[PDB]
């Protein structure tokens, strides 16, 4: 009686939602992005090759000097390079070598790390004693760490595979804030530019955002017809893309609240990995499992360009906050850093 | 390249000198993926041979790293492990179809084409008194059951009742019936029957390995 | 983070002493060590420099040959053996670590040093002694013979501060970072072959010696020392 009405109102909400963004759904980018001149062809060579890891990469993730990157692969290894001269600054050995997600500090001085052994692992790379070691062990999730990144060096945000999302003061050890709203996996997460919203992604088709400081969903985003793998926001955080199973790559407008356009090709049909935006946002760079990673233009939804060197599914990449270069992971356990060429 | 970039690249290197020598000691122990429903009896097997369950034990001084994870997603962590060992309950006729389910998509797994699974068809004591005792029937769960006949071929062992023969065959083939579906020689499946007194299992799992880790360079030396 | 040295004392010329330096608090086999003597009432003169898995040895012209530098990473000790000894070896000798990755801070932990009893490119610091008041801003100038700034971007200028009986404690490395637990206050610019100290709001702490090492390669040279006094 009671749940059946309740469940009838909740019917009507979401048709309630449904029409309120087909009102706002005046023009498509593409009509609006017709206009604009193509970015050409997006040529980007192999300048780096960082070999060194025994197992397949799992997450990478950029310093915010655009030269330090730190790896983790299943090989129980948390490496941290050197992108320039492909140096290993550190090398840190993991107590459980199931890694699924790295994440580097914006100050630089720990990196974050976690799998299937629940817990997020804090680590101190500046130590007067000369190694990096464990300062804390993130423990609360009964799933897999899927996604991990600071907010500062007491702040972190987590997504695990029991379809929640957790805020974590370091110092303490405990979750300020616990995101639930998720009927699948979180699979990834993007912090927002200014860290007071996170956009996350689910195998429930669906990414959600939400309010770090309140603490609560404040728009749901859905279209994909799979698990959503990867998520990333845009430059100026009013957007942001998401990679599905289904071979798809969407640009979700937070304003607006709806899809504002698909990257897809006939021709792909596998998984997409990761997804990231150069340093404007015009180009998007996705990661499939076709070994391939195909370059976006993202206001017009054409291909610009490929990066096809990895012998593997490319399990991740990423964009230096000064947008010279791009690094893509795969599971043949290289490597490779990307630029183009006047 | 200054005078500390050179001192810089030495660290690197003696890190590179340390990652080899910890791939090296990784691959002295074969990695064994543990499977298996709330039934199973997967648990027994493990402690008789000896959130995530890890036992290792030694057949010839050859050392077996078995991770029991206690999933679409997660199971791709286990890409390049050397076997997957699914454990199945035999006696349970209500939940077997269960397991053929769980045992398809793990087959069928795209990130698992190259894994060959060790199954075991645990609990063949229960399957055995079930069978004799005539309370349930086979052939209420599985129609197919009634018109199926124990190939010539078949060897029981000795002092087995045909009625428990014709059961086993049954169940093992239509594990076997999935695994031969699909694959095209990528993967192999290992059935066995094994019990909850048996100590033959880990020995089992070593001679299974052997052809599993055969297979794998026969590829390497064909399918160039 | 300890560095105790030992096995200085009065030795006849032409005579060998082996020096010993016991560390601990730290990873010892994950650090360069340096041996750094210091004449009385003279300069830092870098010694020799064993790298991280004893790899790479380095010395200087006035001691190669005659001194031998090895490490014992189980026991945590780094040794010194002098051979040939002159009266020129009379100094006291600093047990020095330094670790080399992008972003380190190379000598930022020194020894107490021992006593020991014997019976390239230029660092000039023209100006000696420096008066100076508690409160007032004080800069010191370091002049090199070759260009410290190299292609990588990196000018490699380092700046240490010897309190009278303490040994000497980094505060610039690379001519431009403040160390780790040095106050703000101390600041490091400079250009090509020129460089500068700046001491805002000088305090009694801040009386010591000032010296301005390169190294951009070996031999690690020093310089003469500026000393502030009140």
């Known amino acids: 009686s009671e749940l059946d009405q309740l469940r009838q109102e909740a019917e009507q909400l979401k048709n309630q939602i449904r029409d309120a963004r087909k009102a706002c759904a005046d023009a498509t980018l593409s009509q609006i992005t017709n206009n604009i001149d193509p970015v050409g062809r997006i040529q980007m060579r192999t300048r780096r090759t960082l070999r060194g890891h025994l197992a397949k990469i799992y997450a990478m993730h950029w310093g915010t000097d655009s030269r330090l990157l730190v790896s983790a692969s299943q090989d129980g290894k948390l490496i941290i390079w050197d992108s320039y001269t492909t140096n290993k600054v550190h090398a840190i050995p993991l107590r459980s070598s199931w890694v699924m997600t790295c994440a580097y500090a914006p100050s630089g001085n720990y990196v974050a790390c976690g799998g299937l052994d629940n817990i997020c692992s804090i680590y101190n790379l500046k130590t007067r004693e000369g190694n990096v070691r464990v300062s804390r062990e993130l423990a609360g999730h009964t799933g897999y760490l899927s996604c991990c990144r600071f907010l500062d060096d007491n702040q972190i945000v987590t997504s695990s595979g029991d379809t929640t999302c957790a805020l974590w003061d370091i110092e303490t050890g405990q979750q300020t804030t616990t995101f639930t709203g998720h009927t699948g996996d979180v699979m990834s997460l993007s912090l927002a530019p200014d860290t007071r919203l996170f956009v996350s992604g689910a195998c429930d088709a669906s990414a959600k955002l939400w309010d770090v400081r309140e603490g609560m969903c404040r728009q749901t985003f859905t279209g994909h017809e799979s698990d959503i793998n990867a998520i990333c926001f845009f430059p100026n955080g009013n957007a942001f893309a998401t990679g599905s199973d289904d071979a798809t790559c969407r640009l979700f407008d937070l304003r607006a609240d709806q899809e504002l356009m698909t990257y897809s090709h006939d021709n792909i049909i596998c998984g997409i990995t990761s997804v990231s935006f150069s340093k404007s946002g015009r180009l998007l760079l996705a990661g499939y499992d076709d070994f391939n990673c195909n370059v976006w233009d993202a206001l017009k939804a054409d291909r610009a360009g490929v990066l096809a060197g990895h012998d593997n599914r490319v399990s991740c990449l990423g964009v230096t906050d000064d947008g010279m270069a791009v690094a893509t992971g795969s599971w043949d356990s290289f490597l490779k850093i990307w630029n183009g060429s006047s | 390249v200054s005078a500390e970039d050179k001192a810089a690249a030495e660290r690197s290197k003696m890190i590179d000198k340390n990652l080899r020598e910890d791939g090296e000691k990784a691959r002295r122990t074969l990695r064994l993926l543990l499977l298996g429903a709330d039934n199973s009896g997967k648990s027994t097997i493990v402690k008789q041979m000896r959130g995530i369950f890890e036992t290792k034990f030694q057949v010839d001084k050859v050392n077996f790293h078995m991770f029991d994870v206690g999933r679409r997603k997660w199971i791709q962590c286990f890409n390049d492990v050397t076997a997957i060992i699914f454990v199945v309950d035999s006696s349970d006729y209500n939940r077997l179809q269960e397991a053929l389910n769980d045992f398809k998509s793990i087959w069928n797994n795209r990130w698992l084409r190259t894994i060959s699974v060790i199954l075991f068809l645990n609990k063949q004591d229960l399957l055995a008194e079930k069978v004799l005792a005539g309370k349930s029937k086979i052939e209420d769960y599985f129609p197919e059951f009634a018109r199926y006949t124990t190939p010539e071929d078949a060897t029981p062992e000795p002092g087995e009742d045909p009625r428990v023969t014709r059961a086993k065959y049954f169940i093992r083939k239509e594990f076997v019936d999935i695994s031969t579906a699909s694959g095209d020689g990528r993967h192999i499946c290992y059935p066995h029957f094994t019990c909850a007194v048996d100590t033959e299992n880990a020995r089992r799992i070593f001679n299974d390995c052997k052809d599993i880790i055969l297979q794998m360079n026969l590829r390497e030396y064909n399918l160039v | 983070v300890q560095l105790v040295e030992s096995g200085g004392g009065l030795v006849q010329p032409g005579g060998s002493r082996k020096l010993s330096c016991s560390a601990s608090?730290?990873?010892?086999?994950?650090?360069?060590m340096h041996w750094v003597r210091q004449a009385p009432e003279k300069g830092l003169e870098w010694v020799a420099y064993?790298?991280?898995?004893?790899?790479?040895?380095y010395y200087a012209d006035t001691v190669k040959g005659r001194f031998t530098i090895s490490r014992d990473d189980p026991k945590n000790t780094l040794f010194l053996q002098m051979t040939s000894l002159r009266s020129e070896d009379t100094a006291m000798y600093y047990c020095?670590?330094?670790?080399?990755?992008?972003?380190?801070?190379?000598?930022?932990?020194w020894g107490q040093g021992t006593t020991l009893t014997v019976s390239d490119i230029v660092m000039t610091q023209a100006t000696s002694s420096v008066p100076v008041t508690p409160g007032e801003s004080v800069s010191i100038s370091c002049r090199s013979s070759?260009?410290?700034?190299?292609?990588?971007?990196?000018?490699?200028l380092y700046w240490f501060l010897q309190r009278p009986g303490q040994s000497p404690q980094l505060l610039i490395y690379?001519?431009?970072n403040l160390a780790s637990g040095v106050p703000d206050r101390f600041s490091g610019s400079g250009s090509g072959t020129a460089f500068t100290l700046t001491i805002s709001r000088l305090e009694a702490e801040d009386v010591g010696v000032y010296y301005c090492?390169?190294?951009?390669?070996?031999?690690?040279?020093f310089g003469a020392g500026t000393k502030l006094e009140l």
């Open positions: 020095v670590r330094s670790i080399y990755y992008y972003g380190s801070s190379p000598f930022d932990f």
């Open positions: 608090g730290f990873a010892f086999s994950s650090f360069g």
């Open positions: 064993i790298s991280s898995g004893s790899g790479t040895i």
């Open positions: 070759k260009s410290l700034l190299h292609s990588n971007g990196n000018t490699y």
């Open positions: 690379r001519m431009s």
């Open positions: 090492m390169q190294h951009l390669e070996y031999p690690l040279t």
